Structures are given as structure tokens and as C-alpha cells.
């Protein structure tokens, strides 16, 4: 039994290694230390300084350098006793300051132990290296074990959710968020892998597994922060029957990065699929698709990157092709999908020229005809739709000859439409196959980014940040009930903060940012400036969460849960409307392609509501998501990047701390720190501290009484503790002191 077998890879890779003795005595030390900032400037870098003396009011301690310093006892970041180094739950720390938190995490990570609980959260730090803790053999160990029985692990929360589901007959949720490359996708995949195993009977299960490889081909790409970035968020419903077996599944996708199709930063790549196709297509397909090397395509040849290190596009294509096969995509459907991809490539190879007059024209219809071919549309018709769309100028419908820029920008729009619609299609197709109308229970897995604060923040960042404000509030309300419940299950004694930021964004009356945005979107002639001015007119010095910049005329800031975020307004009106000329819609609507036809003919795909804005849709989709979550028992996994360099064994305190500040971990602890953070089961206390008092035996039948004894013996300030129905509750620092007592 691996749990017992100290020689198992379970013990090796998942636990702090244990020696022969448990004896309190081993960890004895007269030394007292604190966490300090060697440089007041950088306050996330800390060093440990041994307290050399103490006043009634302060502490005086020797630095790393050997230089003495002094601090107020009340600002003091006392270091927990060494015994606490490496505990599996930060809730178990006695001194809970930020530096204490970081160190526990660090201690763990230094042993390659990536998972740590912080109360209700499962903290997962990207190791940036392989750890063999996801084998079937590993899965098997977590079956039916309590959180407290096994080591922290993604499999563990997963197992806990499944048992709760079975036991409470309640739907569940796992919220996996964090920064790009923090490891959300990986963790998500492990959750499904595990549920598939633990609850499977397979064919279905297979299809379920296979959807992912498909989605990843189309929704993932190589970026500067990760080589296989998922550029879309998702909510995955794993469905089960009353008996506990997987009966189906559903996927909801969000915020796919369409911009990527037409433009990629230096070093990055376009979506994997493009590459897979160019490399994995039969030389007999190429020709049929007029394919060539990426260097041959504008949408591929601009980042200088066309291949991933230790990645075979050819091989991945096979992988993807197979998956499609398994889920249920006809050989034919598969063509057109490839065709669309192809055609997209072609579209971007159209060179707009404009000398004649001012309007663009096409001297070389090669690329054009190429695309029209694979699309099954009429080049003449498409040619005109791109450069000469009829626009309703009042009562009349007149064709405007577009210049080169506008012309290019239209083609671009056409490609993003095609891409986003195809994606929707894929997802809907997959769901047709996997989804259950008649389902008994479900476990939904939300895998999306946490708060986004980049150099430059745009409309999509406001969106994701809005979602985050809502999930953070959901967590907070969740923690508040659960805490009350606990105090209550024992017999202890005793509306929010995110609302305002939430209101500022999505408020209807007075209108918040998005409503103002929608208002401006109705006027064809509105501009970024009219937009931004309207926003400042409504909120500058008038809404405490908003800030109009001292000099920039194109940005505005929002005080988010994670801090202030500065947004820029460029193209917001265009983003909100997500326009596509109707002539283009016309052109594609008659496609000779059976798939392409759906992308333009099917309203559930070709349009939003078309009537509602992108903002309005975002809002609604989020309300739906939240309502769903609301009906579930949730579980939270915070994924953390250890540094910005994709390096293992490099845990940077500033990078780390900042994530924990933003993701709710540190706040949860601060809040916890205030009450009775340490909650021990009587026997457990006694079992370690019986030697602290006289006459107390390790194994006492009246554990509560015996606890009272030791406490008493040591004359502990009863304000510091609370006797509960099954556990002794301790205020911060109390247990540290106890631990620090003499045998
Ligand atoms: Cl593994």
C-alpha cells in the first residue's frame, strides 16, 4: 500500500520524506526568527533574521549580513517553528503572514511538491519539469480517500468532488484558474482523466478524452509564455447517471483569441492546426488544397517561428485526425474543416492593390480563386464583397469601392469570422456526440484565466477581469458560509466589496462601462474619443473605482480586486460590434460546402442574439455560468507560475507573492489569521503534546480533557483557544508557542 509503503513513488514524489522518529524532541531549538525585507524597496524578497533580543514593544534581530535591526512586535513576521515547514495545508501554520506562506510553499516546491492546500484552495505551482504523479497507478491511490488521508493532489480534489457528488446527491464544480502557463490546462486534463477512470465503464469515455486533442489543435498555440497555450477559456460538464458512471459531457468555450489567426507576435505561432495541416497533409492533399510551406503564407510567415521544439506537426496532425475520427467526424466533414483552414490561409495571401484610383483592386486573383475554391464560393462574388460591398446609405443600398487598408481589414474580419464560427461548430459537433439531455448529475470544470494585468489592457482584458470579479466574490461568499458552518458544527462563536467594481462594469442604471459602450455602439460615427470621453464624463471623480489618467487621453483605470488595471480604448466600438460586411455573409451563405454553409446559415452560429453586442453577450454568458456554479458545491484550484521564464527550480518570491495577492489566497489567509486558524482534533494534539504536561498519556481516552490538561499545565491564555465539539481551536501564534514549549 503506497500510502504506507515509504518506498513508493507515492511517498517519493508526493510527500515530505519521513525519517525513523516522530519525537517532538528532534525539532527542539531555542532559536526564534522573523521574516524581513533586507531592502525596504523590494518587499517580497525577505530574509530570515534571528531575533537577538526583545523589548516589550519590539524585536531586535540579526540580519543575514550580521547587521542588527529592530521591529515592532505588531508588524513582526514571525517565522513558524521548523516542524511547520512543509505542512500540506497552509491552514496548519500558526504564524500566517505572507512571508510565512511563501516559505511553506517554497519548502514544498524545493522537494518538488507542487500541490499545497490553503484552506479551501488547492494551490498548484508549475514545476516546469516532468513529475510522474499522474499514472494510472497514481490515480488508483486516490480512490475514495479523504482529503486528509492523502497528499495534496489534483486527483485528490477530484476524488473529493466525485464522493460529494455521490454522497450528497449534489452537482459539483472545480474552478481552475491562473496565468498563462501556470498549468490550468494540464490540471484540467488530469481532472477529466481521473473522473474518466474513477467513474468510467470505454467508447464514450474515449470520445470524451478525444475531444480535447481536437479542441487543442484549433484553440491552442505557441506564445512567448507557453508552447502550447490554450487561447480560449472553457466550462466542461462531465455528466453522470444516478449510479455514478459517466453518462456524457458538454463544453462551453469563451474568449477564443481570433486575432491570432491573422497576426502573431515575434516568436509566437498561429494555432497548431495550420502547422499540422501544412506538415501533416498527404502530398495528395496539398495540391488539392494548393498547399505549401508556412513561409508561403502571410498568416504564418511573420513571427519567424514556424516550429516548436520537440514537436512534430506531422505527428500531431495524425493525433488530431485520429481524434476526429473517434468522436464522429465524417471523412468528408474532416475535408471541409481542412478546407476552411486552407482557404483561411489563402485569404490572407490576397494582395490588395490600389493605384488606379483610391479603391483597391486585384491584379492577381490567384490567392483569391484559391480560397473561393476550397470554400465553395464564387470568387467574382467574393471579390466584390471584399472590395466593393454595398452599404445602406439611408434608403439606398450602394456599393462602396474600398481602399487597400479597409479592404485588408475586411478580409481579416472575414477570416476571424470563419475561424470563430468553425470553432463554435466543432464544439457544437462534439457536444452533439457527447452531450446528454437527460443527465442525472454533473461535475463542471471551469478552466479560464485568472485576472489579466498586462502592459496593455484591452476589451478582452476587461471581460476576463469582470468574470474574475464575479468568481472572487463567489469564493468569498462560499468561504463565508463554510466558515460559519464549521464554527457552527463545533460550538464556537462569530453582502460584499466586489459589488461596486462589479457595478461599475456591468451596471444598467446608472449605466456602467459596458452599458455606455453599448450605447455608443449604435452610432456608426462614434469614435474611440467619444467613447472614452463619455466614460470619463460619467465616472471621473464620480465613481471611486474609476480613474481618469493624468495625461493619457485613451486609457482609463479600474480598481479591481487584484488592484488597479489600466485599460486602453482603441477599437472597442469595433470589437463590441464584431462587424462583417453583409455582402460577405451573402457570398458565404451559398457555399457549395456543407460545413461552410452551416457557419453562415445556422443562426446559432452565424449570429449573437444578429442583435446583441459582444459585451451584452459576454455579460449574459457570465450570468449563466454563475447561475450554474451557484447550484453546485465548488472546489478551487489556484494555478501559480513560479517565474516568468519557463524554468524549473526557480521559485521567485515576487512573482509568486503577486499571484497569491491577486488570486485570493493571501486574503483568505488574512481573514482566517484573524479568528481561529488552527483547528486540531483532540487525539492529534494530545498525541504530540502529552509530554508537555505531567500525567498525560499519549493515548488518553478523554482527549479533550487531556488537551485541557496540557493547556492548563502550561497556563495558556484561554483567550487563545476555544474548545470545540471535536477540535481545539487556536488563535494565530498560539500553537507555535505551544510547540515551542519544554518537554
Ligand atoms: Cl505521470
Swiss-Prot record:
Family the entry assigns:
Belongs to the TRAFAC class myosin-kinesin ATPase superfamily. Myosin family.
> Which cystines does this chain contain?
none
Myosin N-terminal SH3-like domain location: 29-81
Query: Any idea which residues bear N6,N6-dimethyllysine here?
Result: 129
Indicate the span of the full protein covered.
Answer: 2 to 759 of 2116
Q: Where is this region: Actin-binding?
A: 622-644, 722-736
**Name of this protein:** Myosin-2 heavy chain
| Complex and partners | Myosin-2 heavy chain is two-headed. It self-assembles into filaments. Hexamer of 2 heavy chain subunits (MHC), 2 alkali light chain subunits (MLC) and 2 regulatory light chain subunits (MLC-2). Associates with elmoA.
Q: Tell me which positions the record assigns to the signal sequence.
A: none
Query: Myosin motor domain spans which residues?
Result: 85-743
| Additional record remark | Dictyostelium myosin-2 has no K(2)EDTA ATPase activity, perhaps correlated with the absence of a Cys at the SH-1 position (688).
Localization per Swiss-Prot or TrEMBL: Cytoplasm, Cell cortex
**Modified after translation how?**
Phosphorylation inhibits thick filament formation and reduces the actin-activated ATPase activity.
Per the entry's comment, what about the domains? Answer: Limited proteolysis of myosin heavy chain produces 1 light meromyosin (LMM) and 1 heavy meromyosin (HMM). HMM can be further cleaved into 2 globular subfragments (S1) and 1 rod-shaped subfragment (S2).
